[PDB]
Amino acid sequence: QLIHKDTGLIKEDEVFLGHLPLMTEDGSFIINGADRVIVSQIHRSPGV
């Protein structure tokens, strides 16, 4: 929703972001027609 600060007139619009790759069955995405995979990453957990 696009709301003007002045007129206080709410103008609501739905838009289209784009095409985001979705996960297949076994858990391997298909990018550029080729079956690919995202390997898990690891790092020291945030904190003190």
Partner DNA sequence: CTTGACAAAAGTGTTAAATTGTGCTATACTGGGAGCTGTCACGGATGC
Question: Applying CB under 8 A, which residues contact other proteins?
Answer: 2-4, 7-21, 29, 31-32, 36, 38
For DNA, the closer of residues 18 and 46 by Cβ is: 46
Tell how far CA 5 is from the center of its chain: 29
Pair of tokens at residue 30: 């298909």
Minimum distance, C-beta of residue 34 to other proteins, in the bound complex (Å): 10
What is the rounded distance in angstroms from the CA atom of residue 34 to the CA atom of residue 25?
15
For DNA, the closer of residues 27 and 46 by Cβ is: 46
Binding residue (CB under 7 A) for DNA from 18, 44, 47, 48: 44
Q: Residues 6, 14, 19, CA angle at the centre, nearest 5°?
A: 135
